[PDB]
């Protein structure tokens, strides 16, 4: 039994049905987690690193995949469909579409760097025994992106693109001069395409980046790719298992095969440099890694169960009213029979309430096994003192006596700073 | 419509390519509108009407659609996926999310206190029509429907319906005043499963709720051939055209056909009554309606271009600084070289800047052309008084001279009103 499957069983995160083999179901909780990760990524891309989200078509004509050469390339690794017969097929990747977007209009050097980002679902057909859990899948969401820029600025872009990664694995996340990840730098093979000039410019720029990075990097000379240099992000498990999550890969083949052009400052037509960018890699896979790392214990913001309120006596009126009040505040929800709707950027916390008639210790225990980030209990003392008893799960000495307000502000100041 | 296409051309909303007929290109501005509408509906369903978002797989075995009953009537325009060098069980693509949610409900044992249990699905849908039957935003192959379903005991039914109507009364009766009611309803009983007197009982409860409604309504033979009664919500067009924006279905067939059950307080298994719900319907279509009605006039909430700053003298440093100050301090963007992450719920505004060297009147030339919702101008008097000149979109005369913070607070208090 995998850790993933186990945590899913416990928290009701995921589902799998034979009617849809290899395709992942997301329950309301897995929903919350997924959507939250995606939201974080979106904010970071749009409001910091300058990416513009687009939504591309899921399926394309055979002729398109033939233009990119990914038709014969992906044979049984890609699904297919027939139309009323042109023989359409489903996109394993976002690349060709994002090339079309660039090609549809006349581009100028002043629009560059032009960066696109797409969260659209991706379907890949793999052997019935090849796919296991979230790591190897059929239908999987990936956060993609592409940078179209003049060579001069390439370095800068790479830098920024790495910074994002640095913020993800080395800052916002646990599990390991001393950093979380190292980098595999993949140089030119013996057989390649595209002029060697821009090739060496690229490679040199990269050598400079990694050199001044401070992060450790393996040279891995000569492996991949005929369309140009790669960078693989490597993070190691607490179990010592080494994982490649995201990859930054320059592509010289698509610009030439899709014939993309941009007006330069010298008023001549030059072909733009394309950069494949990923961070979370496979979102499902990323969630996998997170699961294996935290074994089901989520940071306060990502946690499907943010906190729980337990009254000492189920039949105690004071405690009941107090708890219900705090809940109603923390969840921040509006009645359905009402009219006025919910606004934007208003805070909402899950905050379940246990009304079960069992003993206090029982709800404590069960709620602990349930992973809740914060346990808030109300006894006689809590009632008389008009406060709440709150604790973090991962420490188990906190026990702060806090007012509704103070709690609200604490959770807000939590999701604001993440962690 | 050449309207939607015109607005798409001026605002850079949507793109189309021969290589993908039926699939719409969503790129950055149209994607902004899209994602924002979707976000609104999200918040509303989640923190108000008590819905849980889920993500179902795009691929399902033909066996599923068989067992559901869609493999017969709706298999006509449905799309199939082979992708098999061997069997080839003939997995079909999902035009609709109906069966998936039933799978989700039936997966785990449930009881009476888990109801009403409401899901929602924003997952992409592909329905294949004739090559010429395609209207650009009206009918596509690939589109996103808000969908959603409800599982509740009979006692809950009326309740769940009323609330489900309230949601509508938000979007139409309130939010969008495109034209004391903005809508009227329709009717049902068009191959069905079960007893005739049972379906007639459903028509009795639905007619009973419409009798208790207080809204205009009509009748019709052919709506919702199955699994039971229904209410079609029609909107009178800009000019003399009635459409159907959303549909509310009452389905007694699926619960019995998928063998769904729960445990009533008496500890006996009863068959749940499910309600198919929709509000936005097709988001491409709804978006089309919006485009036609508003012409590219979209309010400050939905607007891709939220505003523009005009430096009456473009070569003046004193004015420029006061401009960029407002820009940077408005969009609230962060440096790309920082390790500083973009927080959540932090406000952001598009608020472009025109440094083009021309007469100020020419930079005002296209503002209301590009359809900016506000026009901000900085002159000498604006620097001396340390404020900005704000001109309202639809107000040809009235303007306000406001400090930065006032523009901030103003915009925030605006987008919070869904203005
Ligand atoms: Zn790519
Ligand atoms: Zn349905």
Domain locations along chain B: 1-295, 296-419
Smallest Cα distance from A348 to chain B, Å: 8
Beta carbons within 8 Å of A15's beta carbon, 6+ residues apart: A25, A26, A27, B103, B104, B107
CB A101 within 8 A of CB A54: yes
| Domains B1-295 and B296-419 fall in the same CATH topology | no
Side-chain-side CA neighbours of residue B324 (13 Å): 8
Residues of B in Cβ contact (< 8 Å) with A54: 25-28, 31
Residue B72's closest CA among B230, B257, B276, B246? B257
Triad B99, B105, B106: Cα angle to 5°: 90
Residue A2's closest CA among A402, A292, A410? A292
| Pairwise CB contact (< 8 Å): A344 & B54 | no
Q: Tell me the backbone φ, ψ of residue A298, rounded to 5 degrees.
A: -90, 145
Which candidate from A28, A163, A341 shows the least CB-CB separation from B337? Answer: A163
Query: Is B144 one of the annotated active-site residues of the chain?
Result: no
Q: How many CB atoms lie within 10 A of CB A359?
A: 11
- B-interface mutation test, from A52, A59, A140, most B Cβ less than 10 A away: A59
CB A146 within 8 A of CB A275: yes
Q: How far is the CA of A28 from the centre of ligand 2 (A)?
A: 18
Residues of B in Cβ contact (< 8 Å) with A91: none
Terminal alpha carbon distance of chain A:
29
Experimental technique behind these coordinates: X-ray
| Pairwise CB contact (< 8 Å): A84 & B346 | no
Three-class SS of B277-338: CCCCCEHHHHHHHHHHHHCCCCCCCCCCCCCEEEECCCCCHHHHHHHHHHHHHHHCCCCCCC
Give me the residues paired with residue B262 across strands.
B270
CB A382 within 8 A of CB A263: no
CB A324 within 8 A of CB A351: no
Which candidate from A31, A90, A334 shows the least CB-CB separation from B54? Answer: A31
Q: How far is the CA of A161 from the centre of ligand 1 (A)?
A: 14
Residues of A in Cβ contact (< 8 Å) with B335: 48
CB A110 within 8 A of CB A78: no
Tokens linked to A345: 């950027």
Q: Searching chain B, which residue's CA lies closest to the CA of residue A333?
A: B47
Q: Radius of gyration over alpha carbons of chain B, in Å?
A: 25
CB A54 within 8 A of CB B25: yes
Q: Distances in Å between the alpha carbon of A228 and those of A188, A273, B413?
A: 6, 11, 50
Domain A1-295: give its CATH code: 3.30.930.10
Tokens linked to B115: 């109801």
Q: Tell me the backbone φ, ψ of residue A358, rounded to 5 degrees.
A: -65, 175
| Pairwise CB contact (< 8 Å): B130 & A84 | yes
Which ligand ends up closest to the CA of B151? Answer: 2
Domain B296-419: give its CATH code: 3.40.50.800
Angle in degrees, 0-180, between the axes of helices B28-47 and B157-170, rounded to the nearest 10: 140
Q: How far is the CA of A145 from the centre of ligand 1 (A)?
A: 6
Which candidate from B47, B81, B336 shows the least CB-CB separation from A348? Answer: B47
Strand order in the sheet with A273-276: A52-53, A114-117, A146-149, A273-276, A242-251, A230-236, A181-186, A217-218
Residue B78's closest CA among B67, B89, B70? B70
Query: Is B276 one of the annotated active-site residues of the chain?
Result: yes
Tokens linked to B56: 């179902």
Q: How far is the CA of B37 from the centre of ligand 2 (A)?
A: 21
Which ligand ends up closest to the CA of A277? Answer: 1
């Amino acid at each position: 039994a995998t850790m993933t499957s186990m945590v899913s069983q416990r928290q009701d995160l995921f589902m799998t049905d034979p009617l849809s083999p290899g395709s992942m179901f997301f329950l309301p909780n897995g929903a919350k987690i997924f959507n939250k990760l995606i939201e974080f990524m979106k904010l970071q891309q749009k409001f910091k690193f300058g990416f513009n989200e687009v939504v591309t078509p899921l399926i394309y004509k055979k002729t398109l995949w033939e233009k990119s050469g990914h038709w014969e390339n992906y044979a049984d690794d890609m699904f297919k469909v027939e139309t009323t017969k042109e023989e359409y097929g489903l996109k394993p990747m976002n690349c060709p579409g994002h090339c079309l977007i660039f090609g549809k209009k006349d581009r100028s050097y002043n629009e560059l760097p032009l960066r696109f980002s797409d969260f659209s679902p991706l379907h890949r057909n793999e052997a019935s025994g090849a796919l296991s859990g979230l790591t190897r899948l059929r239908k999987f969401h990936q956060d993609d992106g592409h940078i179209f820029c003049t060579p001069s600025q390439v370095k800068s872009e790479i830098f920024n693109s790495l910074k994002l990664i640095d913020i993800v694995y080395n800052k916002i996340f646990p599990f390991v001069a001393e950093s979380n990840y190292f980098i595999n730098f993949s140089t030119r093979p013996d057989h390649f395409i595209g002029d060697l000039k821009v090739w060496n410019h690229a490679e040199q720029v990269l050598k400079e980046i990694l050199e001044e990075s401070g992060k450790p990097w393996k040279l891995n000379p000569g492996d991949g790719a005929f369309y140009g240099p790669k960078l693989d992000i490597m993070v190691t498990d607490h179990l010592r298992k080494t994982h490649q999550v995201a990859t930054i890969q320059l592509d010289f083949q698509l610009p030439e095969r899709f014939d993309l052009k941009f007006k330069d400052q010298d008023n001549s037509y030059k072909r733009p440099i394309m950069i494949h960018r990923a961070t979370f890699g496979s979102i499902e896979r990323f969630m996998a890694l997170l699961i294996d790392s935290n074994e089901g214990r989520w940071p306060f913001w990502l946690n499907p169960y943010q906190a729980v309120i337990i009254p000492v006596n189920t039949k105690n009126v004071q405690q009941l009213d107090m708890c219900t009040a705090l809940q109603k505040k923390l969840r921040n929800e509006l009645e359905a029979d009402d009219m006025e709707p919910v606004p934007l950027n208003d805070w909402h916390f899950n905050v379940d309430l246990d009304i079960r008639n069992e003993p206090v210790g029982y709800r404590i225990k069960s709620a602990i096994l349930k992973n809740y980030s914060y346990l808030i209990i109300v006894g006689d003392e809590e009632v008389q003192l008009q406060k709440y008893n709150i604790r973090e799960r991962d420490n188990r000495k906190s026990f702060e006596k806090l007012t509704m307000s103070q709690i609200w502000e604490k959770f807000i100041e939590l999701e604001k700073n993440y962690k």
